[model samples]
Target: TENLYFQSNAMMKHVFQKGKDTSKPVLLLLHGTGGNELDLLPLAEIVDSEASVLSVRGNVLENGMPRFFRRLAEGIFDEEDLIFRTKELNEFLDEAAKEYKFDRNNIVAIGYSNGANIAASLLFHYENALKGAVLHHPMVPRRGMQLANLAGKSVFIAAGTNDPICSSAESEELKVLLENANANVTMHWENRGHQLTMGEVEKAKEWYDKAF
Candidate 1:
């Protein structure tokens, strides 16, 4: 019955590169606002040089800029759009794994800002959607809702101490929520603003090395 996965949802524009080491978890690279699939290719190399990479572009266009989901304001999300997009991306990964010969259950996400929020939504809504995630400056995707049990999953959240877009309080809330779901979560702090800094990337890589 699973074979009837033939539903036509417009595929997200993406790039796929099979890596040298099949043993490593496949890296799903997600870029921030105004960023494309290519934006995080260099990041994937820094995190794990040998892991396979699947970089996806967000399907939704916000004023001609690509974003995974819609937002009502600076920090407010469109819940309906977010839920639909999360399921769409999840299905894409499932189909992508089958077509690319990668292990479906071994995908890990490295996302920043807007991208990270969608990745967070995946883990929030679906069990095992990602083996792990490295989120850079993400806000809480959803609130006042139930989260899937995430036991055995690992997550590393990198937050800026002075972020105007994503507050430190938001980061703290994310950590608490994920931990409540039984996810092994680590929240790293940096002394910067909303920008994704090199120090943050390195710290995320350090956590990735330990987690994966």
Candidate 2:
């Protein structure tokens, strides 16, 4: 464990990379279970080279696998822990914004798999936590969250219609939830399952153009 020591009760043993311009946007990349900080750092370049990158490692360990929240079953999650971690992470991001010179108003988040679920949970429950987000293969755990708080955000969702790991209905419902929250949402649907395709990437590029 390390210490970032931000003003708030926010600090983590996380790694950070400074960008060229302080006023530019910040991209916080989150990795899935069993992933570390370095796992999603490479995607920072692919997503946006100019943006300052801040990748976070999950805090919870489950059978040596790291995750953002506790899981009751395969697809079921503990809403209590989910809300707690999401709030803690958002506070950390706020402190991180003060330490870094990135444009706080233009912060973006991107995650995949379990990481995507965490990112989705953050965007869903927090207020003014993200300007844009890319959620790939995400599932939203049912709960009574303050869904109306996502007023001016944009989100890009990429999913496979046949993904058994994360069902198609789950993806559709998640997208609808975001839209109903008044977020500008872009969804890319693939005919395949559980893996990436050229079409998903292309749609992502298009969504970035429109959302970001």
TM-scores for candidates 1 onward, in order: 0.94, 0.88
| lDDT (C-alpha) at residue 150 in model 2 | 76
Model 2, span 89-163: residue lDDT tens? 888887787776456667788787888887887787776788888887888855556685677788888999777
Q: Give the clash total for candidate 2.
A: 0
Against the reference, the lDDT scores of all candidates come to 0.89, 0.77
Q: Candidate 1: where is the Cα deviation over 4 Å?
A: 1-10
Candidate 1 lDDT over 142-196, as tens digits, reads 8987888899999999999877787798799999999999999998889889888
Q: Evaluate residue 42 in candidate 1 and report its C-alpha lDDT on the 0 to 100 scale.
A: 89
Model 2, poorest ten-residue lDDT window? 1-10
Q: Give the Å shift of residue 41 in candidate 2.
A: 1.9
**Of the candidates shown, which would achieve the greatest lDDT relative to the real structure?**
1
User: How well does candidate 1 match the true structure in TM-score terms?
Assistant: 0.94
